[PDB]
């Protein structure tokens, strides 16, 4: 599991911050990890160390082995857990509606569908007139830039895979090594 500690080297790099990461570095050696030793070594605060440990406990990152004196060992199989749910939420914000180019009247900032201004469509002017005011309609304008968000997320969320490729690959090859 030396390359299992390598997926770990890449997640600490990829995610948790210096204060967390320094503690996580100690977690590297899964031989013996007491609370008094880790406190004295990290040169951290006891309340604060307890917060980080409690945070790591929340990850189920560690299996608190009681004597009382403690020991801590990896539990996260949630690398997929962050993945399946995050991909869902990003694909929700990505998947847009349609051209959804509803007429919108710039004077009253009222919103219409292509259907809304179609009933309004004024045959004497060959264009679309707003309802209560005859001022000509415009594009959905700003409204929801879900299409720009789709493009951005795609570049941004899938652009972090290459830098994660080292670990996405190590994990995959390490899991195969574990059998």
Q: How far is the CB of 127 from Zn ion (least distance, A)?
A: 14
What string marks each residue from 115 to 154 as x (binds Zn ion by CB under 5 A) or -?
---------------x--x-x-------------------
The response to whether 64 counts as a known ligand-binding position is: no
Q: Pick one of 32, 41, 152, 163: the residue that binds other proteins (CB under 8 A).
A: 41
Q: Pick one of 1, 13, 15, 25: the residue that binds other proteins (CB under 8 A).
A: 25
Q: If binding is defined by CB under 5 A, does position 108 make contact with Zn ion?
A: yes
The DSSP secondary structure of 129-176, one letter per residue, reads B-SSS-PBPB---SS--HHHHHHHHHHHHSTTSHHHHHHHHHHHHHHH
- Spatial separation of the C-alpha atoms in residues 178 and 45, rounded to whole Å: 37
Q: If binding is defined by CB under 5 A, does position 105 make contact with Zn ion?
A: yes
Q: Pick one of 2, 31, 43, 155: the residue that binds other proteins (CB under 8 A).
A: 43
């Amino acid at each position: 599991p030396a390359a299992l500690k390598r997926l770990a080297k890449y997640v600490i790099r990829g995610f948790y911050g210096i204060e967390h990461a320094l503690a996580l570095d100690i977690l590297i050696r899964n031989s013996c990890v007491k609370e008094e030793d880790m406190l004295e070594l990290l040169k951290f605060d006891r309340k604060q160390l307890r917060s980080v440990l409690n945070n790591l406990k929340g990850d189920k990152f560690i299996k608190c082995r009681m004597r009382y004196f403690i020991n801590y060992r990896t539990l996260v199989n949630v690398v997929k857990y962050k993945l399946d749910h995050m991909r869902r939420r990003i694909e929700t914000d990505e998947r847009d509606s349609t051209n959804r180019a509803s007429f919108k009247c710039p004077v009253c900032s009222s919103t219409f569908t292509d259907l809304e201004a179609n009933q309004l469509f004024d045959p004497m002017t060959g264009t679309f007139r707003c309802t209560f005011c005859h001022t000509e309609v415009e594009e959905d304008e700003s409204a929801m830039p879900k299409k720009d968000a789709r493009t951005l997320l795609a570049r941004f969320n899938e652009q972090i895979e290459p830098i994660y490729a080292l670990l996405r690959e190590t994990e995959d090859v390490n899991l195969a090594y574990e059998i």
